[PDB]
Nucleic acid binder design. Structure first.
Ligand SMILES: [K+]
Ligand SMILES: [K+]
Ligand SMILES: [K+]
Ligand SMILES: [K+]
Ligand SMILES: [K+]
Ligand SMILES: [K+]
Ligand SMILES: [K+]
Ligand SMILES: [K+]
Ligand SMILES: [K+]
Ligand SMILES: [K+]
Ligand SMILES: [K+]
Ligand SMILES: [K+]
Ligand SMILES: [K+]
Ligand SMILES: [Mg+2]
Ligand SMILES: [Mg+2]
Length: 1327
RNA sequence: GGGAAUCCCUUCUGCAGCACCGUUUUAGAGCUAGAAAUAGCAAGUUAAAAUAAGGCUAGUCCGUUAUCAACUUGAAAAAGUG
DNA sequence: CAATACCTGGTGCTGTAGGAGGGACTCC
DNA sequence: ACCAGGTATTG
């Protein structure tokens, strides 16, 4: 018995089919287990497994790290209280106890209900004096009086609990605070550098202009408008824009060639400045430095909006300013509404449901919603002008704890904390002794390279300790081995050398590694001149001279430099032809030039004796990112360099690692030559072997040593998990393997001939970030003129409009937003060649005509017109490098014939790595024996197809698919994959190279474009029967095999199986609901009675459990027999599984039939009467469990009538005539749907509404009626009910809110294919 | 066909370290006329604590990913069954 | 019990290795 | 937004 397997691997489905020699699908009698009167069943060997999407680990990780941070914040507060313990016990022996129980109701409080002072008078007095904590913070910073220890604790604890971010290294307030002073010093530096062209900055209020609550460009324009002979794009204007955070281009200021685009926010600025300082000189370093200082001052003025000379707590002072202006404006606004619009005062200030002030303070109205609600009210009244100004500044009636407080750096809270400590250590000795301890509590962070401070019970931890003792913020440097931990952080993530698996890979920017790369590329260069008979390699001396003259004097070596600065200067060649390199060398000695600029000792870099040292330095610069640790490591070489050079070395850092180890590059030596790999790269006679040739040459010992150096096997699941790909497709892959195992077991452990596999093919925030970055880097204002919300960017044309800066991409013209529907979206490379519909291959233009010819890439004229605009869009990252290269390919010859042939080959031949991994897995599982030559015996051919093959097959032979009808199309795709792949390799066996796993352009283009014509009877004529040319074996009978495919697709019995899964994840909805009298509320803590404290509800059921027992009834507690479904929640699952009987008895059940406990996961299948099926959605809800096997004729009619996806106009007219001749299929389809719904769905109201809706639109165009009949199948689809629209009529979902019936129905346990069943009559349970 | 180093992009998987809000109960004396229901007015911006219940291994650790038909063994892991 | 209608934790930042899609270039 | 299961209100 010979057979093949077809597979369709998706993210939510694995379709499977078994075919025979004649492309038929077998059917078998399968034994049925259980307690029913059915002993066996007929099954077709075709089906599809369905499953919920596999989830990434991201949400779990975010929750885990948030858990850690909550624990550590609690620990900070605990450290502070431990410091305060004894003296607070002297002052108030229950203060911390009152703080701990602040959440409890007075009933459950063991102490007085007023936390700070324990009596109502003192508490009310405190609140009257300090309405916000920031009042107390400012007072404890400024005052000289001894203060109550409890208020000191409250201030310090508030600073420590909410300490602020750590984006800024070093200390703050370094006299970079005043904006006036830094603006004036910038003017000083500018006038020093440009004596002849000075700026009169007198009378310019730099403070108010630069610190204003406005956009960067607006403040730039404001400051420039106060400078007459100055424009915003001049040098001083560019410096001010740099200080404001924009992206100025200093090219035009200095008449440069290199585009000196500078942004202080980017990571490259430090080099971007230095690079710029190369051309203009070092005299301008002070200018850009003053600009950087001014930028710091403006950033601080964003947060501190108060004069810093009246208080040492400007942050708390700014919060108090918020409070005071809120109070004044609230009084004024209340008076306004009292006098003018009194009929609205109650709604504004009493209705929490409304987004007024009441809903803003007491309800759920945010600052934005409150502004939106009150802006028209302020506009409607008189005297609200300053209020509307404050509102449009987003600075009206502000709270202190707000979303934007994320700006506040931790150093400001630290300054306030340090000031309070300095004030109050004069009166409390323990504050003086523990000042730095508290400061350290605030400042200390666990470094990212250290990880969790575990002690052997964390699978995530890598930290190593110097000494075995409890880690605290104060003993961290002594207990934690930061060096070993930071090294393990990297070395656990980095690959070893694959050639030498025990050797660590070199740093990417290692000098030796770059030498290796440069020589490896330079060895394959060839050159010709006039007198030369044949192109020649570069000799060792030639390569060394090129390295010394060009690679060690320029960061990049171009081909022009090679021709002129070497072949002309040294070899005296006026003309030379170069091969092996184009435009410029890819490899370069970048680290060499970095270190040459830093240390300024070329002889030091060139001396081989220092090699090791330099390597180690680069290692330190690559392995570590903490500047203190880098300094500590470089300290061993302090004697070799000046302190200035040592500082500059500290600041330089590298990221990334190579692919080869030092021992491979320059360690192992060929036995006879005694030469390393790099030695051969530098000089190898006239053979000039590169790395690949060197390690594969049988006349050298490199290959032998590599084989010798090679060295536990993964499980199937482990191997699949370690694949690179989405976890969803990995779930699909493992399910595919299990399906194949079961199918082989079905066929009596006989392995198939072939296995044909095909693998299927927030974000608006990403788009808005893309466009913001591109426009601000571009310097455009299209966002000013056209505000847009991230959701709108999901329209393709508008997103393209913004990525193109509102311009045509083929014509140097502006485009109109309001006319986007009149424009075109065009593919850069035509979709007839590259089926690419991403934004990467798409372009918004006024007319696609202006592209040029439609058979190729945009013409040369358009490229010459628009290359500059495209390069600007590329530098703004609004288009990618690939998009730019495809747009500009016409200047490089456009599309060659080889390119089109390759595009069609790509359309047909699968090349994704993950599909190859699936093929390898199946192949290594199926083929395990070796022959006489010890070569693998490939009994099973693993073929991989792309979806376009079977899609075109369906569209060419009218085997159409409609995904909304049911789930049968996955199984049908698997069947068609099996058939098409088997026939394709039977017809052309040589194609086994391309399609089977294991080891002229016009001609190939023609061949691949017409590879599937042997199925056709006439082309653009061919025999009916199609055979193999050499074997003479028949591969396709066009008179009988298409009928076989049609009959297979018409079979109504298809094994659709929904994978039953225990639910995991969160216990319930995260919302912390207010108190409520309901047993649904769940306590957030053991003693927090939800009736008093609120809590959660809506828990997730891990799985239900069938319980057959007795429950007490009535006041008499009489035992009554019951059979019911109990949903074990995810939170209850461990307790239930530890002891099921005790768990159930705690719920109330008595005399539980232990052996009759059935574990029912989600989607458990039950059959009732008339084949009606239900799936377990929960313990108290059901899902639809049946498939609607709509006959093939109705499916094809619906495909054709709805214009689902053309062909010849004669064929189009024939299909149209078929539709119009079979219009009665509409009523027939509605009849099929109605019979199915009355038998199985059981939604009387929805079915009647649907019948009325269909009878209402019977005069509608056939296209529309068919398109909405497509929607109608949501009523009948398998799974959870959902709402659907028939035209404008909306049908809400009918839900099955009871599970009582399945307790007496037939439970069906299905194998992974559903061919093996166990049926349990549940009516025989309970009595 | 498969594979490797380098260059330019683009993207995704795993991990660690942090910040800001939100919510929840309590605290921040509401007043006056009424017996009351209620009416009129005042007021509001802040804090504490929790942020998966919790666990033992007690760490400044772990607690939401992956994996799961039934049945027979078997504590499990596992093998087997049509 | 049925029809119905609501509801559903969110944002921002730093560091890091690896695989893999597209295009070059040299090779096994 | 999604889905789609939990929940209270209504009857
Ligand atoms: K009490
Ligand atoms: K001006
Ligand atoms: K609010
Ligand atoms: K490693
Ligand atoms: K190049
Ligand atoms: K580094
Ligand atoms: K020195
Ligand atoms: K799971
Ligand atoms: K899930
Ligand atoms: K209150
Ligand atoms: K199953
Ligand atoms: K990442
Ligand atoms: K990457
Ligand atoms: Mg906790
Ligand atoms: Mg808060």
């Amino acid at each position: 018995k010979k057979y093949s397997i077809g597979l369709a691997i998706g993210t939510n489905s694995v379709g499977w089919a078994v075919i025979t020699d004649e492309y038929k699908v077998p059917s078998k009698k399968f034994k049925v287990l259980g307690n029913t009167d059915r002993h066996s069943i007929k099954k077709n060997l075709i089906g599809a497994l369905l499953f919920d999407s596999g989830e990434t680990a991201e949400a779990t990780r975010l929750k885990r790290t948030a858990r850690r941070r909550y624990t550590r914040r609690k620990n900070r507060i605990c450290y502070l209280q431990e410091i305060f313990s004894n003296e607070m016990a002297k002052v108030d022996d229950s203060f911390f106890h009152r703080l701990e129980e602040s959440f409890l109701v007075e009933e459950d409080k063991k102490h007085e209900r007023h936390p700070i002072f324990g009596n109502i008078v003192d508490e009310v007095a405190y609140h009257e004096k300090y309405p916000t904590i920031y009042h107390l913070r400012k007072k404890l910073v400024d005052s000289t009086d001894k203060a109550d220890l409890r208020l000191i604790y409250l201030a310090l604890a508030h600073m420590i609990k909410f300490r602020g971010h750590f984006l800024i290294e070093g200390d703050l307030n370094p006299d970079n605070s005043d904006v006036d002073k830094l603006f004036i010093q910038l003017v000083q530096t500018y006038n020093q550098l440009f004596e002849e062209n000075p700026i009169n900055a007198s009378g310019v209020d730099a403070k108010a202009i630069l610190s204003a609550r406005l956009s960067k460009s607006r403040r730039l324009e404001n400051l420039i408008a106060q400078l007459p002979g100055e424009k915003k794009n001049g040098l001083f204007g560019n410096l001010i824009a740099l200080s404001l955070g924009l992206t100025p281009n200093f090219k035009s200021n200095f008449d440069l060639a290199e585009d000196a685009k500078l942004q202080l926010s980017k990571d490259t600025y430090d080099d971007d400045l230095d690079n710029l300082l190369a051309q203009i000189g070092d005299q301008y370093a002070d200018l850009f430095l003053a600009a950087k200082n001014l930028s710091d001052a403006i950033l601080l003025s964003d947060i501190l909006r108060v004069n810093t000379e009246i208080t040492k707590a400007p942050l708390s002072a700014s919060m108090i300013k918020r409070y005071d202006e809120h109070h004044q404006d609230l009084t004024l606004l209340k008076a306004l509404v009292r006098q003018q619009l009194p009929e609205k005062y109650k709604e504004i200030f009493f209705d929490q449901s409304k987004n007024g002030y009441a809903g803003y303070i007491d309800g759920g109205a945010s600052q934005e919603e409150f502004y939106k609600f009150i802006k028209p009210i302020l506009e409607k009244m008189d005297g609200t002008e300053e209020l509307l100004v404050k509102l449009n500044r987003e600075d009206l009636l502000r709270k202190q704890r707000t979303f934007d407080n994320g700006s506040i750096p931790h150093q400001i809270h630290l300054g306030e904390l340090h000031a309070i400590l300095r004030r109050q250590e004069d009166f409390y000795p323990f504050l003086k002794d523990n000042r730095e301890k508290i400061e350290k509590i605030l400042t200390f962070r666990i470094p990212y390279y250290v990880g969790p401070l575990a002690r052997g019970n964390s699978r995530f931890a890598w930290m190593t300790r110097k000494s075995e003792e409890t880690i605290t913020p104060w003993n961290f440097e002594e207990v934690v081995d930061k060096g070993a931990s930071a090294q393990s952080f990297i070395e656990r993530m980095t690959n070893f050398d694959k050639n030498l698996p025990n050797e660590k890979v070199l740093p990417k920017h290692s000098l030796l590694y770059e030498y290796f790369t440069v020589y490896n590329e330079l060895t394959k260069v060839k050159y010709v001149t006039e007198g030369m008979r044949k192109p020649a390699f570069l000799s060792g001396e030639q390569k060394k001279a090129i390295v010394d003259l060009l690679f060690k004097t320029n960061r990049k070596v171009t081909v022009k430099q090679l021709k002129e600065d070497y072949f002309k200067k040294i070899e005296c060649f006026d003309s030379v032809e170069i091969s092996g390199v184009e435009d410029r060398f890819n490899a370069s000695l970048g680290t060499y030039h970095d270190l040459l600029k830093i240390i300024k000792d070329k002889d030091f870099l060139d001396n081989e004796e220092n090699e090791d040292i330099l390597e180690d330095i680069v290692l330190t610069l690559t392995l570590f990112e903490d500047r203190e640790m880098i300094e500590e490591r470089l300290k061993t070489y302090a004697h070799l360099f000046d302190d200035k050079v040592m500082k500059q070395l500290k600041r330089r850092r590298y990221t990334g690692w190579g692919r080869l180890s030092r021992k491979l590059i320059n360690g192992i030596r060929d036995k006879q030559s005694g030469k390393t790999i790099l030695d051969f790269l530098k000089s190898d006679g006239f053979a000039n072997r590169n790395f690949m040739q060197l390690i594969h040459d049988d006349s050298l010992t490199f290959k032998e040593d590599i084989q010798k150096a090679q060295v536990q096997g993964d499980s199937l699941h482990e191997h699949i998990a370690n694949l690179a790909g989405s976890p969803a497709i990995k779930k699909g892959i493992l399910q595919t393997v299990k399906v194949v195992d079961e199918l082989v077991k079905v066929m009596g452990r006989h392995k198939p001939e072939n296995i044909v596999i095909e693998m299927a093919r927030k974000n608006s925030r990403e788009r808005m970030k893309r466009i913001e970055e591109g426009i601000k880097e571009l310097g455009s204002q299209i966002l000013k003129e056209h505000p847009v919300e991230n959701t709108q960017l999901q329209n393709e044309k508008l997103y393209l409009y913004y990525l193109q800066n509102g311009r045509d991409m083929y014509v140097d013209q502006e485009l109109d937003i309001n006319r986007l529907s009149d424009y075109d979206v065009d593919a850069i490379v035509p979709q007839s060649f590259l089926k690419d519909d991403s934004i990467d291959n798409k372009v918004l233009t006024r007319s696609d005509k202006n592209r040029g010819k439609s058979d190729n890439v945009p013409s040369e004229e358009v490229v010459k017109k628009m290359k500059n605009y495209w390069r600007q869009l590329l530098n703004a990252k609004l288009i990618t490098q690939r998009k730019f290269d495809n747009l500009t390919k016409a200047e490089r010859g456009g599309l060659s014939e080889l390119d089109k042939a390759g595009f069609i080959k790509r359309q047909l031949v699968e090349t994704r790595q993950i599909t190859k991994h699936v093929a390898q897995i199946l192949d290594s599982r199926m083929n395990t024996k070796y022959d006489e030559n010890d070569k693998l015996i490939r009994e099973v051919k693993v073929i991989t197809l792309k979806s376009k093959l079977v899609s075109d097959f369906r569209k060419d032979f009218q085997f159409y698919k409609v995904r909304e009808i049911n789930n049968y199309h996955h199984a049908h795709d698997a069947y068609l994959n099996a058939v098409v792949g088997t026939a394709l390799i039977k017809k052309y066996p040589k194609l086994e190279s391309e399609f089977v796993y294991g080891d002229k352009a016009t001609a190939k283009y023609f061949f691949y474009s017409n590879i599937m014509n042997f199925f056709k009877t006439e082309i653009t004529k061919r025999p009916l029967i199609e055979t193999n040319g050499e074997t003479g074996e028949i591969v396709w009978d066009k008179g009988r095999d298409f009928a076989t495919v049609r009959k297979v697709l018409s079979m109504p019995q298809v094994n659709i199986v929904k994978k039953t899964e225990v639910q995991t994840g969160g216990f319930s909805k995260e919302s912390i609901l207010p108190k409520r009298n309901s047993d649904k509320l769940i306590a957030r803590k053991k003693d927090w009675d939800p009736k008093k404290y609120g809590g959660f509800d809506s828990p997730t059921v891990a799985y239900s459990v069938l319980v057959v027992a007795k429950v007490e009834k009535g006041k008499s507690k009489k035992l009554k027999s019951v059979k019911e479904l109990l949903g074990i929640t995810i939170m209850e699952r461990s307790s239930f599984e530890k002891n099921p009987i005790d768990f159930l008895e705690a719920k109330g059940y008595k005399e539980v039939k232990k052996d009759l406990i059935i574990k029912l996961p989600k989607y458990s299948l039950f059959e009732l009467e008339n084949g009606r099926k239900r799936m377990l959605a929960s313990a108290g809800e059901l899902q639809k469990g049946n498939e609607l096997a709509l006959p093939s004729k109705y499916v094809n009619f619906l495909y054709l009538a709805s214009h689902y996806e053309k062909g010849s106009p004669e064929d189009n007219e024939q299909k149209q005539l078929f539709v119009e001749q079979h219009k009665h299929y509409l009523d027939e389809i509605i009849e099929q749907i109605s019979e199915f719904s009355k038998r199985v769905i059981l939604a009387d109201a929805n079915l009647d509404k649907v019948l009325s809706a269909y009878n209402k639109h019977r005069d509608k165009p056939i296209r529309e009626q068919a398109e909405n009949i497509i929607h109608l199948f949501t009523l009948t689809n398998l799974g959870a009910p959902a709402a659907f629209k028939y035209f404008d009529t909306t049908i809400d979902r009918k839900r099955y809110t009871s599970t009582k019936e399945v307790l007496d129905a037939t439970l069906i346990h299905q194998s992974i294919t559903g061919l093996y069943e166990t049926r349990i009559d549940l009516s025989q349970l309970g009595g």
